[PDB]
């Protein structure tokens, strides 16, 4: 008989779908062949990036006394982190707003 | 009674990661769409960088090291090194398992 089916994500200890990433790589016109470890590695990298952004967005939501992530929290998380801001520098987040930043010269002379 | 077509998305995996990093925290539909678009964009960036890396070296296979070099090229510093560490750990665990 055949062995019980185990997902490649479970073997890799990842939450992102290794099989779906592998299928997308094969059918994405990227290369003639795709190695076995490439989908695992890419799923791990995507999961880590998602974890970073989601953790920062959850911190922002908790700061805003909210228990649900909205686009504003994602924008705050991305723009408050230097490396994430550099990674998504040319990316616009819908309904994200802008960070509070008023130049000092415009402030009243108190 | 026409069932809508199957549209694949990373929503369930993003939800699992969110529950891992923040158990008592939710995510709206717009935020989920934004996260899905972010995952798709990063996937496209890394895959294209790996494809041009393979083409430059006259190779026909995208391997783990091509993806690693793409991550090192595209990510800003500490993000890159932590992503490389996570990827190598996942690949090592997968190879060790089967």
């Amino acid at each position: 008989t055949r062995a019980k089916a185990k997902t490649r994500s479970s073997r890799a200890g990842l939450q992102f779908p290794v099989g779906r990433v592998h299928r997308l790589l094969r059918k994405g016109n990227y290369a003639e062949r795709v190695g076995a470890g490439a989908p695992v590695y890419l799923a791990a990298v995507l999961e880590y990036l998602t974890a970073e952004i989601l953790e920062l967005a959850g911190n922002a939501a908790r700061d805003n006394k909210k228990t649900r992530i909205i686009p504003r929290h994602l924008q705050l998380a991305v723009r408050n982190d230097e490396e994430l801001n550099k990674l998504l520098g040319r990316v616009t987040i819908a309904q994200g707003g802008v960070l509070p930043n008023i130049q000092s010269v415009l402030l009243p002379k108190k | 009674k026409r069932r809508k077509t199957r549209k694949e998305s990373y929503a369930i995996y993003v939800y699992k990661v969110l529950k891992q990093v923040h158990p008592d925290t939710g995510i709206s539909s717009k935020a989920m769409s934004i996260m899905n678009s972010f995952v798709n964009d990063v996937f496209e960036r890394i895959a294209g960088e790996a494809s041009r890396l393979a083409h430059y070296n006259k190779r026909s296979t995208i391997t783990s090291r091509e993806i690693q070099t793409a991550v090192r090229l595209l990510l800003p510093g500490e993000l890159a090194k932590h992503a490389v560490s996570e990827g190598t750990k996942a690949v090592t665990k997968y190879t060790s398992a089967k």
Binding site: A51, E52, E55 | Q20, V21, E78, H82
Partner: peptide
């Protein structure tokens, strides 16, 4: 349940 070493 999950923490990242980047934020210490």
């Amino acid at each position: 349940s999950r923490k990242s070493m980047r934020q210490s």
